[PDB]
Design an enzyme around this catalytic site. Structure first.
Site, PDB file in Angstrom:
ATOM      1  N   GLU A  37      -9.240  -6.828   7.990  1.00 42.76           N
ATOM      2  CA  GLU A  37      -8.366  -7.464   7.007  1.00 42.76           C
ATOM      3  C   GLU A  37      -7.686  -8.700   7.568  1.00 42.76           C
ATOM      4  O   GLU A  37      -7.067  -8.630   8.630  1.00 42.76           O
ATOM      5  CB  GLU A  37      -7.314  -6.468   6.524  1.00 42.76           C
ATOM      6  CG  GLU A  37      -6.469  -6.960   5.381  1.00 42.76           C
ATOM      7  CD  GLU A  37      -7.299  -7.461   4.228  1.00 42.76           C
ATOM      8  OE1 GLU A  37      -8.042  -6.661   3.606  1.00 42.76           O
ATOM      9  OE2 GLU A  37      -7.221  -8.674   3.964  1.00 42.76           O
ATOM     10  N   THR A  81      -9.450 -10.497  -1.134  1.00 41.00           N
ATOM     11  CA  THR A  81     -10.214  -9.350  -0.641  1.00 41.00           C
ATOM     12  C   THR A  81     -11.321  -8.905  -1.604  1.00 41.00           C
ATOM     13  O   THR A  81     -12.439  -8.599  -1.181  1.00 41.00           O
ATOM     14  CB  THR A  81      -9.275  -8.188  -0.346  1.00 41.00           C
ATOM     15  OG1 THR A  81      -8.280  -8.636   0.576  1.00 41.00           O
ATOM     16  CG2 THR A  81     -10.053  -7.009   0.253  1.00 41.00           C
ATOM     17  N   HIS A 196      -2.181  -7.199   6.615  1.00 40.59           N
ATOM     18  CA  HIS A 196      -1.873  -8.043   5.447  1.00 40.59           C
ATOM     19  C   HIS A 196      -0.616  -8.892   5.702  1.00 40.59           C
ATOM     20  O   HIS A 196       0.311  -8.434   6.371  1.00 40.59           O
ATOM     21  CB  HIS A 196      -1.625  -7.216   4.173  1.00 40.59           C
ATOM     22  CG  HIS A 196      -2.858  -6.835   3.407  1.00 40.59           C
ATOM     23  ND1 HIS A 196      -3.511  -5.636   3.595  1.00 40.59           N
ATOM     24  CD2 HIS A 196      -3.537  -7.486   2.432  1.00 40.59           C
ATOM     25  CE1 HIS A 196      -4.546  -5.564   2.762  1.00 40.59           C
ATOM     26  NE2 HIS A 196      -4.576  -6.678   2.053  1.00 40.59           N
ATOM     27  N   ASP A 255     -12.451 -10.895   6.064  1.00 32.60           N
ATOM     28  CA  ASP A 255     -12.631 -11.183   4.641  1.00 32.60           C
ATOM     29  C   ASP A 255     -12.063 -12.538   4.208  1.00 32.60           C
ATOM     30  O   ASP A 255     -12.663 -13.212   3.362  1.00 32.60           O
ATOM     31  CB  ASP A 255     -12.035 -10.055   3.787  1.00 32.60           C
ATOM     32  CG  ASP A 255     -10.531  -9.865   3.994  1.00 32.60           C
ATOM     33  OD1 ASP A 255      -9.978 -10.253   5.051  1.00 32.60           O
ATOM     34  OD2 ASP A 255      -9.906  -9.282   3.088  1.00 32.60           O
TER      35      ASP A 255
END
Ligand SMILES: O=P([O-])([O-])OC[C@H](O)CO
Ligand SMILES: [Mg+2]
Length: 418
Positions: A37, A81, A196, A255
């Site tokens: 992520e 995402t 994140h 991503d």
């Protein structure tokens, strides 16, 4: 109809044939996607105060059986995402605005889980958040994912849960039970979430100190990257202990960007050079590391994007994708073109790149005042590719076409509730 025809004529003319050194070299093997992520490629081998931020991933990068890409770019837009997922599962772009997952959840797809389903692969997504987010519950059924192990399958106690859901370390540890009872060969994706924006982490979970740029979200970014690194190391340990390491293609990828273009002073310090518009384009590199058992790896410098990943994977598995409406090309093929579209119409090539609609020398970073015929041609090819991909999503064109012998997903046959 004639829209389907225009797209297939385009995609078939672009198709890059498999490389005989790599085609089918992983035939019959499992697939394990490790979704890093918001992880940018500049983190790989990056040292913060003399210390490797992500040491396990660095070791994976250099592993003898790992194909490691240093010029691989994310091609996502507002879907973030969800866009990278659209790219990975279908070799289709997200939409030019909004989220394709949100608005095209009832489209017909001929995705990786369906293509591999044709050969008896079981498929599953693992994610430490609830299946309603990004409309995944709906669109996964069109993809033909047999399983979605979302937050309902995990222990969401408040000590283990962050603001996006389950933390990566208990997530990977509680996933083991499920992965071990999944019928092989399987096709799986593990979507992590601790890394994140704005990258908060408890002091006691942090094994590294923040950077010292004075920009809070850049400084703690390194700490969540390190935590993700450690969780991924534990996961691979399990994979080695369970024997999955030796019978699976394990693919680590990022991503989209972690740091936006609104942190120039901090990123100037981080990367050691003036973080201008050009450098920001260069920072859109994300990792791609493909570990293939028994195949000699090495650094891959050929330019490519997320759109190219599914054709690459299928060829490794010995599956031909020529008749499919897919816009990417096999990254290991000699006929792969080194041209990387961005969702906004910009593009990267090894010689000239268009960034913010303006031309740059890709090797030196110097602005080029005037587009040449060749630059303009490339620009229109990129605009054409994005338009045709959008035509698939907006026209729901896979209703009207499937390759011969392809059996289509019946989405009513999937239920992800416990
Ligand atoms: O506001 P910033 O730092 O440019 O970026 C914030 C993230 O892109 C939103 O998730
Ligand atoms: Mg993301």
């Amino acid at each position: 109809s004639s829209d389907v025809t225009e797209v297939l004529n385009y995609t078939k003319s672009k198709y890059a044939a498999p490389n005989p050194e790599y085609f089918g070299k992983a035939k019959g093997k499992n697939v394990i996607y490790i979704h890093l992520e918001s992880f940018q490629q500049f983190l790989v081998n990056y040292k913060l105060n003399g210390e490797e931020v992500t040491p396990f991933i660095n070791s994976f990068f250099k592993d003898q059986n790992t194909l490691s890409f240093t010029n691989f770019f994310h091609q996502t837009g507002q879907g973030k995402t969800a866009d990278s997922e659209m790219l990975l599962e279908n070799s289709l772009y997200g939409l030019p605005q909004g989220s394709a997952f949100t608005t095209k959840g009832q489209n017909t797809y001929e995705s990786a889980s369906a293509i591999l389903g044709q050969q008896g692969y079981t498929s599953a997504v693992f994610h430490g958040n609830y299946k309603s987010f990004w409309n995944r519950d709906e669109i996964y059924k069109q993809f033909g994912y047999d399983n979605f192990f979302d937050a309902s399958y995990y222990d969401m106690n408040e000590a283990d849960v962050s603001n996006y859901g389950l933390k990566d370390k208990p997530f990977f540890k509680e996933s083991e039970e499920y992965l071990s009872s999944l019928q092989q060969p399987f096709y799986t994706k593990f979507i992590t979430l601790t890394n994140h924006f704005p990258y908060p982490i408890d002091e006691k979970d942090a094994s590294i100190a923040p950077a010292t740029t004075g920009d809070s979200s850049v400084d703690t970014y390194f700490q969540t990257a390190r935590y993700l690194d450690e969780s991924v190391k534990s996961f691979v340990d399990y994979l080695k202990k369970s024997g999955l390491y030796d019978n699976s293609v394990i693919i680590m990828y990022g991503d989209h960007y972690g740091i936006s273009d609104n942190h120039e002073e901090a990123m100037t310090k981080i990367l050691g050079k003036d973080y201008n518009t050009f450098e920001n384009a260069q920072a859109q590199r994300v990792p791609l590391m493909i570990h293939v058992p028994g195949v000699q790896g090495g650094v891959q410098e050929q330019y490519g994007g997320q759109v190219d990943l599914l054709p690459t994977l299928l060829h490794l598995l010995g599956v031909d994708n020529k008749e499919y409406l897919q816009f990417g090309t096999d990254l290991l093929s000699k006929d792969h073109k080194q041209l990387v579209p961005f969702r906004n119409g910009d593009y990267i090539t090894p010689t000239y790149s268009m960034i913010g609609g303006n031309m740059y020398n890709q090797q030196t970073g110097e602005p080029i005042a005037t587009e040449t015929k060749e630059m303009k041609e490339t620009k229109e090819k990129v605009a054409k590719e994005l338009e045709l991909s959008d035509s698939v999503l907006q026209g729901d064109l896979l209703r009207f076409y499937a390759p011969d012998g392809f059996k289509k997903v019946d989405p009513s046959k999937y239920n992800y509730n416990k």
